[PDB]
From Swiss-Prot, chains A, B:
Classification via SUPFAM superfamilies: ACT-like (SSF55021), Aromatic aminoacid monoxygenases, catalytic and oligomerization domains (SSF56534)
Highest taxon of source: Eukaryota
Name of the top EC class for this enzyme: oxidoreductase
Pathway: Amino-acid degradation; L-phenylalanine degradation; acetoacetate and fumarate from L-phenylalanine: step 1/6
Entry's family note: Belongs to the biopterin-dependent aromatic amino acid hydroxylase family.
High-level lineage: Eukaryota, Metazoa, Chordata, Craniata, Vertebrata
Keyword Manganese appears in the UniProt entry: no
Activity regulation, per record: N-terminal region of PAH is thought to contain allosteric binding sites for phenylalanine and to constitute an 'inhibitory' domain that regulates the activity of a catalytic domain in the C-terminal portion of the molecule.
Name used for this protein in its record: Phenylalanine-4-hydroxylase
Cofactor(s) required for function per UniProt: Fe(2+)
Gene that this sequence comes from: Pah
PANTHER family documented for this protein: AROMATIC AMINO ACID HYDROXYLASE (PTHR11473), PHENYLALANINE-4-HYDROXYLASE (PTHR11473:SF24)
Amino acid sequence: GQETSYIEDNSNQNGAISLIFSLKEEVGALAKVLRLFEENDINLTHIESRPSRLNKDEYEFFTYLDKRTKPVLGSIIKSLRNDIGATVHELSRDKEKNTVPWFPRTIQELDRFANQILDADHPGFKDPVYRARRKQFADIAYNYRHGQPIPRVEYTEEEKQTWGTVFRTLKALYKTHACYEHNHIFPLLEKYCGFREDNIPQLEDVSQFLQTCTGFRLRPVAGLLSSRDFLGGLAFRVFHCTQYIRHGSKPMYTPEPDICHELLGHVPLFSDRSFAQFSQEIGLASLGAPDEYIEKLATIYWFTVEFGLCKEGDSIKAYGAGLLSSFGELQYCLSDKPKLLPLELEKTACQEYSVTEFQPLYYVAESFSDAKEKVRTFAATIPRPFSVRYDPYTQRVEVLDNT
Amino acid sequence: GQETSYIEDNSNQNGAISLIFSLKEEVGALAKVLRLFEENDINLTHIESRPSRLNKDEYEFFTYLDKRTKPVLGSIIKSLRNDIGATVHELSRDKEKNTVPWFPRTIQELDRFANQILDADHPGFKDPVYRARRKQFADIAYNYRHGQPIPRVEYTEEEKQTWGTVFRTLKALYKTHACYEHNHIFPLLEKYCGFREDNIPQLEDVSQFLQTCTGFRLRPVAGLLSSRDFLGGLAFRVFHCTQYIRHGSKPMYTPEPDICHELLGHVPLFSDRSFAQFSQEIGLASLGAPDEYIEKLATIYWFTVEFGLCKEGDSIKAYGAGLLSSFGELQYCLSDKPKLLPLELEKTACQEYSVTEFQPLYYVAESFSDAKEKVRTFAATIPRPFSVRYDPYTQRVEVLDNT
Ligand SMILES: [Fe+3]
Ligand SMILES: [Fe+3]
């Protein structure tokens, strides 16, 4: 009711259904389970069995199925539960009765809904060339697949000039308004990723560098994804970021995120361990979270990763990416005009806001470490039949039952 | 003096020198350091700066230099120490006075000495076709680069038949002689990696699966690597394994490791978290370790990963890979002939042994968890100016000063 940053998720044509369950290895168990699936008309390359990462005598099952297996899924869950004997969690993309809202278990699974994106006013609406250029970048995202190197695009001088206009202003403002963490990493991005005022950095280059710092990686997205999907990606330390640039007509404005917003507002901080851990915690807390809490986390995300203020000693600087890529509001947030409140997730989670520039209120975080722990705690209050944790080694979410 | 499994490391033509040091970010520090390198004739793409993963106000430096920069390195270390102010560790591949034995800091660095490998008696010596086939596999290893998918090779029926001979025997013996962990993972390798008696699995397939389980990954090696380099790889959960198969003339024998030995003896257990962690601990304890302790760890490795016996309750099974891929000694080790001693690294580290089949003595491990902690402790006694820890996210060793 005030145009928020919370985008409710859809469902494709087939949607997505995944069954989470572990099976203790007892002679024939593995075969009975696969036989169970085999029997009910299900391709067994959609069922994956792996050793349990928690219990040395169990197998964990991953099922890449969709809505087309719905009819015989009830039977299978029943059998698994009653006959075979296994605690089963049904993850559904259409989050219905008794089903936990779907979420990727493996980083690769981020491919599933990555292409689930959402003009008249938009600068560039009457620009054929721009519209085509946007098609090009959208194509790259749509065609993108996890693991692949992000395709490089040669930016035109015009675009580079737009970049520079935004770059120049912000750089000449980070020292006095940006948090230590941002100002700490930026010089390196300039030195190593081609972050210059006469050059738009290639997403592949930035992704490599990010990984090298925090394991974070980039994924080119065509447009805005549902909060569930964007937040979810953070659990795998994956950042869905645009590659296109705003229209040159108004370099100082974007009614949507763009390469300028991702590279100068988000990327720098994702290179910091504490910050990386913080944002990932928000992603992990969203995994399978009910719509209500996704919006809450989306709101929380908004007042932290996007428009957050960090308290450094006796002063307050900005770390919110929405601030660090918007000179105007970047100066405004540190002025004496905005209302400031300490970060307190229960109140922040229900905070009323609008997407319009120049937020009237900002939340101040003690540190990234404090907020991370702050989110960990808020997460514990989110209705979920289990808890989650990321495994950097296998790049797979490990679902542990509530602690 | 009894032909051991300890292979002392060499040095290429240029060798390898890396400087470990962190720099607190104080105006101009970063530039002074790079200027410092720039000045002394050093390509700055050989110097890498990244945010410290431990201290939020420091930069960590990675230097991919060799022996050709030796002359001006003394000056640079002096400057860094006295002028700039930084604790500097000089890693040298030629481990000389005051230099810590070199070791990869980034997983990619495993490329540096990966191709540093070491016939008359060998079965296949007079076989032109075999020798050429071996050239082919060696080529693939030499050309291999971390990150790349391991090239697939179509094995001849003859080779597949050799595989089957070994496979058949072992499979029909794992139930009664192999540890739970091995028997737990094997069925999955059969179900998912093409581990059949009529099919030699492709290393790429196995690597993917391994990663999916423990993050472990394979790297095709041409022949035997120095203990330092092989053990070191384990720190990154990377297994250097052969791809070629023994000569068909004598399927029941190999005077060297081969695909049969890697896939059936090592791979299964590397899919277990506890085991993966254990072997990695040995790799982490080798990082920069003096030659003496590398041989010790090599010896330890020998009596554990290669020829170790695990105590399961009241019984004892085998987990040593040398045992699990050698039917003959696999039955022998559990007979009443071999001498058995509990795992105790200080005595095991100095244990006398020979490579000849049918070990007279084996060391029994409480569990993989106990041995891992056992190695962690033994490691603390290894002369090193710092301690190490692996970062799965960035795939980079983080060097913390002694704890
Ligand atoms: Fe954003
Ligand atoms: Fe071996």
